[PDB]
Structures are given as C-alpha cells and as structure tokens.
Design a protein around this motif. Structure first.
Motif, PDB file in Angstrom:
ATOM      1  N   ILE D 131       0.648  -1.159   0.311  1.00  0.00           N
ATOM      2  CA  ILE D 131      -0.039  -0.213  -0.072  1.00  0.00           C
ATOM      3  C   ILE D 131       0.520   1.179   0.075  1.00  0.00           C
ATOM      4  N   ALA D 132       1.238   1.919  -0.916  1.00  0.00           N
ATOM      5  CA  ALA D 132       2.282   2.926  -1.311  1.00  0.00           C
ATOM      6  C   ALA D 132       0.561   4.512  -1.304  1.00  0.00           C
ATOM      7  N   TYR D 133       1.604   5.348  -0.560  1.00  0.00           N
ATOM      8  CA  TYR D 133       0.490   6.369  -0.251  1.00  0.00           C
ATOM      9  C   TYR D 133       1.885   7.918  -1.674  1.00  0.00           C
ATOM     10  N   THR D 134       0.928   8.528  -2.636  1.00  0.00           N
ATOM     11  CA  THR D 134       1.826   9.406  -3.439  1.00  0.00           C
ATOM     12  C   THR D 134       1.192  10.453  -2.854  1.00  0.00           C
ATOM     13  N   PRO D 135       2.534  11.378  -2.427  1.00  0.00           N
ATOM     14  CA  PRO D 135       1.649  12.960  -1.693  1.00  0.00           C
ATOM     15  C   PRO D 135       1.303  13.636  -3.119  1.00  0.00           C
ATOM     16  N   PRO D 136       0.451  14.792  -3.175  1.00  0.00           N
ATOM     17  CA  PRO D 136      -0.186  15.848  -3.884  1.00  0.00           C
ATOM     18  C   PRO D 136       1.123  16.297  -4.738  1.00  0.00           C
ATOM     19  N   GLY D 137       1.182  16.297  -6.102  1.00  0.00           N
ATOM     20  CA  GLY D 137       1.823  16.815  -6.908  1.00  0.00           C
ATOM     21  C   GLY D 137       2.571  16.344  -7.383  1.00  0.00           C
ATOM     22  N   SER D 138       2.629  14.358  -7.616  1.00  0.00           N
ATOM     23  CA  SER D 138       2.991  13.958  -8.046  1.00  0.00           C
ATOM     24  C   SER D 138       2.346  12.847  -8.874  1.00  0.00           C
ATOM     25  N   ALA D 139       2.613  12.603  -9.884  1.00  0.00           N
ATOM     26  CA  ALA D 139       1.966  11.181 -10.615  1.00  0.00           C
ATOM     27  C   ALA D 139       2.134   9.583  -9.747  1.00  0.00           C
ATOM     28  N   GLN D 140       1.249   9.297  -9.668  1.00  0.00           N
ATOM     29  CA  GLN D 140       1.203   7.623  -9.085  1.00  0.00           C
ATOM     30  C   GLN D 140       2.703   6.508  -9.606  1.00  0.00           C
ATOM     31  N   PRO D 141       2.750   6.255  -8.963  1.00  0.00           N
ATOM     32  CA  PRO D 141       4.549   5.656  -9.129  1.00  0.00           C
ATOM     33  C   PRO D 141       3.590   4.355 -10.877  1.00  0.00           C
ATOM     34  N   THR D 142       4.434   4.074 -11.102  1.00  0.00           N
ATOM     35  CA  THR D 142       4.838   3.289 -12.709  1.00  0.00           C
ATOM     36  C   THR D 142       5.453   1.474 -11.968  1.00  0.00           C
ATOM     37  N   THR D 143       5.898   1.572 -11.031  1.00  0.00           N
ATOM     38  CA  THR D 143       6.459   0.718 -11.251  1.00  0.00           C
ATOM     39  C   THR D 143       6.459  -0.048  -9.122  1.00  0.00           C
ATOM     40  N   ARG D 144       6.180  -0.702  -8.813  1.00  0.00           N
ATOM     41  CA  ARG D 144       5.905  -1.391  -7.326  1.00  0.00           C
ATOM     42  C   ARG D 144       7.546  -0.620  -6.411  1.00  0.00           C
ATOM     43  N   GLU D 145       8.325  -0.882  -7.546  1.00  0.00           N
ATOM     44  CA  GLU D 145       9.585  -0.346  -6.543  1.00  0.00           C
ATOM     45  C   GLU D 145       9.682   0.842  -6.861  1.00  0.00           C
ATOM     46  N   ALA D 146       9.459   1.923  -7.671  1.00  0.00           N
ATOM     47  CA  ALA D 146       9.251   3.353  -7.446  1.00  0.00           C
ATOM     48  C   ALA D 146       7.856   3.809  -6.522  1.00  0.00           C
ATOM     49  N   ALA D 147       7.630   2.923  -5.728  1.00  0.00           N
ATOM     50  CA  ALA D 147       6.054   2.933  -5.076  1.00  0.00           C
ATOM     51  C   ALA D 147       6.886   2.946  -3.616  1.00  0.00           C
ATOM     52  N   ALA D 175      -3.223  19.428  -6.920  1.00  0.00           N
ATOM     53  CA  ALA D 175      -3.680  18.407  -7.173  1.00  0.00           C
ATOM     54  C   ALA D 175      -3.524  17.776  -5.768  1.00  0.00           C
ATOM     55  N   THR D 176      -3.783  16.452  -5.931  1.00  0.00           N
ATOM     56  CA  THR D 176      -4.096  15.797  -4.603  1.00  0.00           C
ATOM     57  C   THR D 176      -3.274  14.275  -4.703  1.00  0.00           C
ATOM     58  N   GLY D 177      -2.948  13.753  -3.388  1.00  0.00           N
ATOM     59  CA  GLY D 177      -2.756  12.479  -3.522  1.00  0.00           C
ATOM     60  C   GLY D 177      -2.997  10.886  -4.133  1.00  0.00           C
ATOM     61  N   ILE D 178      -2.959  10.429  -4.152  1.00  0.00           N
ATOM     62  CA  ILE D 178      -3.033   8.696  -5.016  1.00  0.00           C
ATOM     63  C   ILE D 178      -2.386   7.430  -3.889  1.00  0.00           C
ATOM     64  N   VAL D 179      -2.981   6.742  -3.408  1.00  0.00           N
ATOM     65  CA  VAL D 179      -3.136   5.027  -2.222  1.00  0.00           C
ATOM     66  C   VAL D 179      -2.756   4.557  -4.005  1.00  0.00           C
ATOM     67  N   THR D 180      -1.859   3.605  -4.204  1.00  0.00           N
ATOM     68  CA  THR D 180      -1.931   2.594  -4.922  1.00  0.00           C
ATOM     69  C   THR D 180      -1.660   1.232  -4.388  1.00  0.00           C
ATOM     70  N   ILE D 181      -2.074   0.280  -4.440  1.00  0.00           N
ATOM     71  CA  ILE D 181      -2.056  -0.912  -4.123  1.00  0.00           C
ATOM     72  C   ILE D 181      -0.946  -2.003  -5.056  1.00  0.00           C
ATOM     73  N   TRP D 182       0.303  -2.444  -5.224  1.00  0.00           N
ATOM     74  CA  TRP D 182       0.994  -3.099  -5.463  1.00  0.00           C
ATOM     75  C   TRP D 182       0.626  -4.919  -4.716  1.00  0.00           C
ATOM     76  N   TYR D 183       0.898  -5.746  -5.777  1.00  0.00           N
ATOM     77  CA  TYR D 183       1.637  -6.979  -5.468  1.00  0.00           C
ATOM     78  C   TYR D 183       2.782  -7.094  -4.889  1.00  0.00           C
ATOM     79  N   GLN D 184       2.850  -7.077  -4.429  1.00  0.00           N
ATOM     80  CA  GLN D 184       4.250  -7.204  -3.670  1.00  0.00           C
ATOM     81  C   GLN D 184       5.141  -9.046  -3.973  1.00  0.00           C
ATOM     82  N   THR D 185       4.166  -9.901  -2.676  1.00  0.00           N
ATOM     83  CA  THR D 185       4.454 -10.988  -3.590  1.00  0.00           C
ATOM     84  C   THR D 185       2.892 -11.438  -4.471  1.00  0.00           C
ATOM     85  N   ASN D 186       3.260 -13.028  -4.815  1.00  0.00           N
ATOM     86  CA  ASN D 186       1.858 -13.355  -5.800  1.00  0.00           C
ATOM     87  C   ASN D 186       0.616 -13.810  -4.607  1.00  0.00           C
ATOM     88  N   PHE D 187      -0.408 -14.475  -4.920  1.00  0.00           N
ATOM     89  CA  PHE D 187      -1.367 -14.787  -3.854  1.00  0.00           C
ATOM     90  C   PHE D 187      -1.613 -16.711  -3.967  1.00  0.00           C
TER      91      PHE D 187
END
Lengths: 225, 229, 241, 225, 229, 48
Positions: D131-147, D175-187
């Motif tokens: 669960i990654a939160y990107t502050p306002p003014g930044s585009a949402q991360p493109t990769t799990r590492e950037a998140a 702008a506004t913040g963005i919350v992204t959910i990344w598959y850290q591991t497999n299910f």
C-alpha cells in the motif's frame, strides 16, 4: 413599545459613516491572521523614506537620466548647477518621490523635509558644491555669494559623497522654499578619470511631517481600462 | 500662507487612508428593451476604478472586512416599491444564469431582500481569502506545471483574491420593463497592509495586469532647464 | 576584510557587516502549524543554506540593470535546486550580497533593492485584445539564475517609478564609497509555505542609476557578483520523480 | 420619544440573520425533551466514521461489487492491484463515503484522512500487498519499486487482515494524493481454497479534519418530485 | 494550492449545518382569472425541496424551533399596500376553505396581519410534536390493526411530524384581481439531531416515501479501470 | 427587535432642536484652538 422619534438624517447613506452592518456570513471564520513582515500602519512612515528626486525633469531628458543632476568640469565657477523648489505636492521634481506622491492624496500638509545628495563621481574626483536653501517668500539666489549668505552647506564631495539638507518647514496648503546647488569649486580630477559626474537627490519627510484631509489624487485618470 | 502647527497623525493612518466607502461598481439590472434579463451578476472587484486600484496597490498584501451598500433606483432616479434580491454568491459557489434560476434559492448564498423604496441595503463581507491576506501583486502562476504558453496569461493572477459575486434581481415573475441601476459602495474595515510599494506611475492599460504602454510617461512634469523655477 | 565560511563555500568580504535587514525582520523558521505538525517540514543544514555565487553580470555604460526572482533564481542550482524541484511546499529567507569590482577610476551608482512580489509587466505598443504582447513571457517573469536585463528600468518593468523603488529594502552601491550591498530578506508571503517553482516571493533588482563611466584604458565593464545564501529554508512534501 | 435613526439595512430580510421573532404560540409548552441515544452535534464526528470506499467504480461493475478491490492469483508480480486518489469531495471512489458526501456540503476542507484495508480472503490465503501513498503534486508510481521508495506499507494479509494508512493532509479548496496497491508477492493458497479474494477499502477523516463555508450539495437534483 | 492550517470546528456543527433560513414553500394567493380564491393554505413542509429533504434525512430524529418569514409580492414584484392575513393553523385545527370562512376568525389560530408594503412578517413556531423529536424515518404504521392493505400506503408516515398550516389571504371583501406570490422562508433554530444516517444516494421519486427507481444509480462516478486516475 | 413606537413629532425638522447629527468628516482634526485675546461669551458684557 419603547417610544422613539426618527430625527433628520434617518434613511440617509453617508458613505463615510462608520456604521455597523450585519455580516452576510455569520459563523464564518476567516483565515487566521499570521505574521507577515513589513506591515505599515501609517503613510507618514512612507513619507519618511528617502526616494529619488527627479531634479533633471527637463525637456528631452528621458528615463533614468531624469533622476541625475549632471555635474561636470565647468569653464566658469560659481555657476548654478541645479535648482528645484521644495514642494512635494506640486508638479516638478518631487512628483517622483514617495512623499510627493502621498501629498497628492491629501489636501494640506506641513512639516520639515530632508534632502540627501549623493555624489556619484569617481573616487579620485574632488571639489566643493554649495547646497543653499532659500526660505519661502524669497527668490532663488542669483549668485553663489548671495546663496552663501543664507542657509547653505559647503559640500566637499571629495571628502564625503553624501550630504543631508534639512528643510525646516514647507506647509503647502490647498510660496515655497528653493534649493540651489552651486559650483563652489571646479570639478577636480587627476588624469584618466571622468570629468563629468552625477548627483542623486533624494527627498523625504521628517517625523514632524503631517498630512490632512484625504483627497483623491489627480496623478491617475480613469479611461476605457 | 503658512501653517506653523502640526496636523493630526491619525488622518495618515492606513485605516483612515482606506476608509470612506466608495463606488466600486455600477451594475444595471436590465429588464426592458432587447435585454429582458431581470438580473445581473457583479463579481466583487475592489479594483474596478483606477483610483481605488492605485490606492490599493500602494500595499502588497491587504486584509480587511468590507461593508457593501447598494444604492439602487430607476433611470429617472425614482425608487418605487419594487422588491429586489441582493444575493451574495460566496467564492466557489455557482452564480445564477437566469431570472428564475435555481441558484436564487440556495440557502448557503446569503441573500438580502429589500425594496427600492427602502434605505440602501448594507451588509458586511468578512475576509474571504484562503491566504492570510489579499494579494494585489502575485509574482507567480496559480497553475501547476511549466508555463511556456504563447500568450502568457494567468501570470500574476492570484486566485485567493476572489471575494464572490453579488447577484441582483427583481423578485418579479416576468419582465418588469424597468431597468434598475445599482451603485455598489464598499467600505474597507479593519484594513491591515503589508509591504508598501511605489504608487503606480504609468497609466493602467488593462485590468488584472500591470501592463503599461510603450510610450513611457515621465513621473515628473518637464521644466525648461534644470535651473529654472 | 574577513572570510565568511558557510558549509563548503567561502566568500571574501569586508567586516563591519553593513547589512540591510528587510523590514527589520530576521528570517526565522515558521512556528509549527497544523499542516506542519504532522509532516515536520525539512529544515536543511549548511549543505543547502550555503553561499551560491551566480555568474557575474558585466555592468557596462549602457546597461539598464538586472533582476532575479529569488525562489526561481536557485531552482536549478545545487542541492537547494533539488529541494525546491522535489518538494511541494517551500519557505525560506535569503541573504543577498551584491558585489562590484571597480577601480577607483570607475564611477557609477547602483540601486540594489529587493522587491517583494515583483510582478513583471509587459510593455505593449497598443491595447490589443488579450494578445501575447499583454503579458511577459516566462523568460521574463522567471529569468532563472542568469537574471534578466531590464527593458525599461525607469518603470522597473512594472509600471511603478524607479525613483520610489527605495520604498523597498534597498541599498546603494556608489562606486566611490562602497562596492558591496547586503540585503537580508525574510520569507514574505500571504501563506506560511508556497510553491518554489510557481511563486517567486520577491525579486532582487540591480539598476544603474548613475551610469558607469570611465576613461579610455580602464576595464570597460565592471563585474557585478551576486552571492545568495538561503536562510532558514524549509521544505515539505518530498517527491521522487 | 427616545431619539433613533434608521440606518441602511432596515426592512431588509437577510435569510441568514439570527434575528429574534415573536412566538406565534406564547405559553405553549413543547413536549419535554427526554434523552434519546445517538445524538450527534458535529458533522466532523460523522466524517471520522469509516465508510466503504467505492474503489471499484469501473464501467460495468454494478451493485456491491463496486465496493470490492478484487485480488487474484497474478501471473505477474509487482503489478498494480488498484489505485485511487485521496480526494473526498471530488467524483470518484470517495463519493460512497460519509466524509466524501459531507465534503460535498462544504466549500473548503483540510485535514488528515485514514484509509483502512480489509482483506477478505480465506484464512489459508497469504501474501503481501504494498500500500503506497503518493503525496500531492506527484504522478502515481509506475512500478512497485518506485512506490516502495515513497511512503508505503508492506501489508502481509496472511498475518493481519486489516491495515490502516493515514493520509497526512489533503486540503481540497473550492493536485491530490494517490493511494496505490501493488502485488508485493503472489497470492499464495494451499489446495482447495479460492485463489481470488477482495480488499474492502474504508475511508474516513481524522480528528484534525475541518470543514468550511457550507454550500448546497450537487449530489441531488430537484425535479418533478 | 494547499491550506496547511485548520479551519473552524463550529462551521461543521449540527446547529450551523441546519442554519440559514431557506425557501421551504412558494404559495400563490390566486385572486384573478379562473381562480378567484383570494386565499391559500400551505401545509408546513420542511421537506418540500429535495435539497433540504436530503439534508434533514441525514438525521433520524430532529427537534427544533422554526422561524418563518413570508416574502410576499405581486407578479410584477411590486408590493402595494394590500393587507394580508398570515394565519398559522396549529396541528389539529381546521383549515379555512373560503376567502371569508369562519376559521379566519378563530382566535386560537395565531394570525399575523401585515401589508405587502411592510417588511416580511416573521414568526417563531415552537417544537410542535407530541413526541420528543420529529421523525424523518418512522419504520412503522400509525394505524392500529393488521396492515395487509393491497396498496400499502400509510407505511413509514409518522403522524407526529405535523407542524400545522399557514393559511394566507387578502383581507379583501371580494376578489382583488391580483395574484400574490408568497415565498415562505424557514429557519431551523436550536436544532438537535439524533442517529445520523447515510445521505440519500438514489433520486427521490415521491414525497413522504423513500421509494427509488428500479434503475439503481451508482454512488460513485465510473472510471475506465480500477487503476486509472 | 427592541419594541419601539414612533410618537407624534417624528420626521419633523424643528430648526431649533439641539439634535445630534453625524459628522461628514469623521477623524478630521480641526485646527487646534489657540488663545485669542478678547473673547466675549455674553452680549450683556457688550451692553455694559
């Protein structure tokens, strides 16, 4: 109910009455006031700030050159370098000052003014100028000697590059003093240094300066904006 | 000729310099002829006239509450018993677009009902800015991103100065055939000013921009010589 | 004469520190607000709050002057530029040291003033309806670290008379008496923090009132060096990009 | 009688003035106020109640399925599971929240928000989400590492089925913040247990959240009711 | 862009959320044309408009006194010296049925006599319910007995919410030939609310019933994907 | 508001009533009063 009686002046709108109106947005909390540097609460504090006098307000002089009193190697001594009346609120060199522009927003003003002169020649340049102030009601001096006989300052710009002349009182209501600059000596320079220089005159008000009867200025004109 | 006494120090205070409610807008509620609008929306503009604009631009930041008074009448100066609605549309609220628009009923828009025959309605608008003070000069861009737009508008336009609108209408059902002239008078109260600036010397060309003409006008009137008085 | 060392930067300046304090206010860290009570904005050390010496402008006889918008003048310069480019909110004061290197045979006078909210105006030949000639391009509103030469210094390129620019925190550089001007400008804004990339809190103007004069043989251009030291800089909302 | 003078603003009706009107029924005793449980005196107390975020507000998703963030056995890891902006007052996943609906009744608001994630897979299901939160003014991360390089939470839903992400500040003015959910591991699942699950996102405000300038909402529209 | 400061906690209070008197009814005293009624009876309805209905249904129980203001005028917005009678008909009292009905003289009906030329008449109606609070939601039947009626009306209709009527008439002897438009503004005072509820998401179909259309509208606007922003 | 009742004599202008009018120029400080010799406060002093 409580017996009242409407007096003359009811229903009138005065445009200067410090009445009490109801707020359209009760309970609305405005943005809390944080500290901002540079708050000014009196226009007199702005009048007391030295601002450049446009003494060279002559025909053909354009731009920043109007702010400079040209001083050059004179073929004749005791010549008048420059003169200007001490009248902040009137048209002339004082229009370019903050005090001169604020006086335009008022009807009466009185107090002492200060006029600072900065010599901007080379460090090797030397000589003397005679800063003479003629009180109101007297014509400007015709010779350097007549100026010397009154209130004056023999300014040796070879020693100090800045001098302050305090005008004791002006009091322009709805004549005026005159400041004259005379070549006391020639413009003395060693070789390989410019023989022409400039004096920058800065005008301001003293702390006894006061304004009265706010009046809309005439420096700006409403058109098809 | 000469006044050897000192005047009052209070007449030069910033509070007194910005007192004395003055005309800030002249709107006409047109309801006759080719414009059967029956309403008008006046965006609250403290700088509608160059005199007040120059007086305000003496300072960089100003914070104040404003008392608005509406002097309304017909073209022949008569004030019949026509009921008017002076609706204050706060910043961020939608303005009306018709005589009978739904926005006239919005309870969050403070509205004043007064007849032309009544004394001029008068209300106090508080300090409406998100910032701690209004900005008459905003050296920046309200947008976010790079600003290489060809016509570089939006420069210097502070968004925090929005004070709202005053939508005025008759409470008629149809056109009344009478145009109403409303003179909006605004009084600056509790004014506090920061960072004094030079008073504008060049003529104002447009509103919202300090643009000046290419022909610079000298601050001081010309003399014959530097030695003449 | 002494050597002020801040961080890894050292400048050669004279003593007695005849410094102009803008509005008698020292740059201070903002007291913790509600927005800052949760993120604790970054207060960088002498790593960022060091001396930045820009490229020297060459004061010539016909120079009209220069100006620098200050949050912008360091946006692409070193670690301060990094912190400004990659933080949402920014707040800082500045110590600005303008120095001239002129002989005793050069003459002229500079007005060094720090103008808060120095909104640059365009000078249009005629009132055209919302045309490009009504607004200054970004090159003029944010000249960067190279500064911008004044077009009409008489009106400060802003419609206000230069003669009254002394109402701002200012300092004279009269070549015959001094060649250094030091202005310390605190953070002045209608907000506690702001965008360093969009809003320029103030501009620093260096305008020759008395034009530069010299006789044949002297250096035809007096170098004007601008040294900037951010004071009490704060940043918030760090990005990655 | 007592001398008075009617000032501007007499006879006006303000619709927000807290005036005093006479009661039409004096002496009428209303029904005495007894205690009723569940009195709320501030809408902020309602904004601080967690309500389900309609994160799956996608085309074709209907009914309760819009409230579920589908999580399944991914063929690729570091994939983005779901993302949504932290903007209660704007259209989007926050419309389904109580805070998001109350913000519609106001013009400005600011404060910290909390976002709780509930994993609703089987007890035997395990894995990690980022669960990654990107502050306002930044585009949402493109990769799990950037998140991962920003503010994030490595959520092992095999250990705890609920996690809370506190958004430090939003401050949406009129702008506004963005919350992204990344598959850290497999299910990861043993045999005979569903390989697809759901995450329920719940949004709410913190106690520092404040509202300002009541404004009639646009979520409802008056028609021929 | 961002406001790092905290706003006021009072603007979010229930008392402030329900303040600001708003239009709750627009009645017309028709006295011309095909309807020479000369009077109209307005049942006091706090939920006449869906905006206020949705705001009120945020809470289950509400207790408040109400300040009513009557903004009356003719169709051309003029306010001549016509005398109007705003009679408050309390719950349980019979309403008028004619311009000159005997119910207009009932002293127990609080009546307000005001001319159109006067400022808007304004009265305070207290909390009129037999219960300790009004109920915007009443999961029950006011009747007594088994409720297998085919059209199951009377379900959910709380009888304790009756606040009365406002019968308005001219004090004329015959028809005046002028229609009068009365805008009833109601201010909620001393409001106390209980049991907060979800704000209505589906469009209101009818009054007094929470009936919604068969085409459910999503609470949130749609996205392209669950990963797009 | 506060219950009042206009009595006969409202809106009249008496030309001798010592009423109170609002100043058109609030904050205007008049020229301070200095001493001038020969002030007379009663016409009886002139009759004598």
């Amino acid at each position: 109910g409580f017996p009242t009686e409407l007096k003359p002046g009811t229903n009138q709108f005065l445009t200067t009455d410090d009445g009490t109106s109801p707020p359209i947005l009760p309970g609305f909390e405005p943005t809390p006031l944080i500290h901002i540097p540079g708050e000014f609460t009196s226009l007199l504090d702005l009048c007391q700030v030295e601002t450049i006098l446009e003494v060279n307000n002559t025909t053909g002089t354009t731009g920043v050159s109007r702010l400079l009193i040209p001083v050059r190697a004179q073929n004749n001594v005791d010549q008048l370098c420059a003169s200007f009346q001490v009248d902040p609120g009137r048209n002339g060199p004082w229009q370019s000052t903050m005090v001169g522009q604020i006086c335009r927003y008022y009807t009466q003003w009185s107090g002492s003014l200060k006029v600072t002169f900065m010599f901007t020649g080379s460090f090797m340049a030397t000589g003397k100028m005679l800063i003479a102030y003629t009180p109101p009601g007297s014509a400007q001096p015709t010779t350097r000697e007549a100026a010397m006989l009154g209130t004056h300052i023999v300014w040796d710009f070879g020693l100090q590059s800045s001098v302050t002349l305090v005008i004791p009182w002006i009091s322009n209501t709805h004549a005026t003093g005159i400041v004259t600059i005379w070549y006391q000596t020639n413009f003395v320079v060693p070789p390989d240094t410019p023989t022409e220089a400039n004096i920058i005159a800065l005008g301001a008000a003293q702390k006894n300066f006061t304004l009265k009867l706010c009046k809309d200025t005439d420096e700006i004109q409403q058109t098809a904006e | 000729r000469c006044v050897m006494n000192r005047n009052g120090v209070n007449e030069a205070s910033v509070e007194h310099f910005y007192s004395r409610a003055g005309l800030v807008g002249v709107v006409e509620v047109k309801d006759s002829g080719t414009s059967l609008d029956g309403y008008t929306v006046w965006p609250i503009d403290v700088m509608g006239f160059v005199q007040q604009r120059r007086k305000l631009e003496l300072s960089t930041y100003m914070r104040f509450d404003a008392e608005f008074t509406f002097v309304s009448n017909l073209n022949n100066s008569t004030t019949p018993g026509m009921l008017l609605q002076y609706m204050y549309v706060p910043p961020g609220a939608p303005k009306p677009d018709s005589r009978k628009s739904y926005q006239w009923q919005t309870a969050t828009n403070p509205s004043v009902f007064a007849k032309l025959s009544d004394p001029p309605p008068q209300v106090s608008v508080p300090f409406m800015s998100p910032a701690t003070a209004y900005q008459w000069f905003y050296d920046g861009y309200p947008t976010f991103g790079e600003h290489k737009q060809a016509t570089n508008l939006q420069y210097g336009q502070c968004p925090n100065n929005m004070m709202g609108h005053f939508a005025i209408r008759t409470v008629s059902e149809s056109t009344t055939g009478k145009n109403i002239h409303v003179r909006v008078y605004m009084r600056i109260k509790h004014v506090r000013a920061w960072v004094p600036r030079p008073l504008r010397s060049q003529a104002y060309m447009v509103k919202n921009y300090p643009t000046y003409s290419q022909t610079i006008t000298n601050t001081a009137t010309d003399r014959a010589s530097i030695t003449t008085t | 004469v002494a050597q002020l060392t801040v961080g890894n930067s050292t400048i050669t300046t004279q003593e007695a520190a005849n410094i102009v304090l803008s509005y008698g206010e020292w740059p201070e860290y903002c007291p913790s607000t509600d927005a800052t009570a949760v993120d604790k904005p970054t207060r960088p050390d002498v790593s960022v709050n060091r001396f930045y010496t820009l490229s020297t402008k060459s004061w010539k006889t016909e120079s009209t002057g220069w100006y620098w918008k200050f949050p912008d003048v360091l946006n692409d310069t070193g670690v301060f530029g990094q912190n400004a480019q990659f933080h949402y909110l920014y707040r800082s004061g500045f110590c600005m040291h303008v120095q001239c290197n002129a002989s005793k045979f050069h003459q002229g006078a500079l007005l060094v003033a720090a103008i808060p909210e120095f909104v640059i105006a365009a000078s249009s030949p005629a009132t055209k309806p919302n045309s490009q000639g009504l607004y200054p391009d970004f090159a003029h509103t944010n000249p960067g670290k190279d500064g911008q030469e004044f077009r009409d210094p008489y009106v400060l390129d802003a419609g206000i008379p230069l003669s009254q620019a002394l109402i701002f925190p200012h300092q004279w550089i009269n070549l015959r008496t001094n060649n250094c001007a030091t202005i310390i400008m605190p953070y002045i804004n209608a907000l506690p923090f702001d965008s360093a990339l969009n809003h320029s809190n103030f501009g620093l103007v260096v305008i020759p009132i008395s034009p530069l004069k010299y006789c044949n043989g002297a250096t035809t251009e007096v170098p004007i060096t601008l040294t900037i030291a951010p004071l009490n800089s704060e940043f918030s909302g760090l990005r990655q990009a």
